Design a protein around this ligand. Structure first.
Ligand SMILES: [Ca+2]
Ligand SMILES: [Ca+2]
Lengths: 128, 128
């Protein structure tokens, strides 16, 4: 059927909204009681309203945004993407759990680039 | 049926192996031609053999290991976990794609802790 492709459509629009700084559009995808976790800091945000207000406040719209990859099966979705402010990018992961077509739980990680180490160069492909 | 639960069983064993530094057991889960990507560095590792040798070499067995959460649907799996060396932990994400019960593509991210910022304290729950 269309179920996964419908989620993927919603996700494409979500990320477009995020790049565009359309905070309303960016939060359309969430259940009202959606939770958003940052495990790196132990923080949990409760509710679509709170999530939108917090994001809109800071850091606000990214200066740079690009989706790397979106994978999903059933109600489990994961988006790999880059966001950047001040010429400092973050390799970002958003793990989303859906119910009835809406996000009920998002978990985000924000990671730094690192240099491919010389020692294993002979054994890796550089794919970007 | 049992399909997902069978993958989850394999994953539990995978991570136990990783904590234990059992590099053989740790690599049982992969297809022979499995690829492992580090998007933060643009590196791709091709093959179970290469992946095992590289991991075994450096950084080798973690001084500290703990699974945070495992989610999965069908052939898409994502493990959130912590690894630590020298009292420096990394909030890690491993995204795994399965085919016929074996990992064909893993993508890993290694992220730092960050302090929950004061400004949004009134609006977040600290869950750890
Ligand atoms: Ca409600
Ligand atoms: Ca082969």
């Amino acid at each position: 059927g269309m179920r996964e492709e419908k989620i993927r459509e919603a996700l494409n629009a979500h990320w477009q909204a995020s790049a565009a700084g359309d905070f309303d559009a960016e939060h359309d995808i969430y259940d009202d009681d959606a939770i958003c976790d940052y495990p790196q800091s132990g923080e949990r945000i409760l509710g679509r309203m709170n999530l939108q207000a917090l994001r809109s406040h800071h850091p606000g719209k990214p200066a740079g945004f690009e989706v790397r990859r979106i994978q999903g099966e059933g109600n489990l979705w994961i988006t790999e993407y880059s966001i950047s402010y001040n010429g400092r990018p973050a390799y970002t992961v958003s793990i989303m759990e859906f119910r009835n077509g809406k996000v009920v739980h998002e978990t985000q990680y924000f990671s730094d680039p690192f240099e491919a180490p010389g020692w294993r160069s002979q054994w890796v492909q550089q794919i970007g």
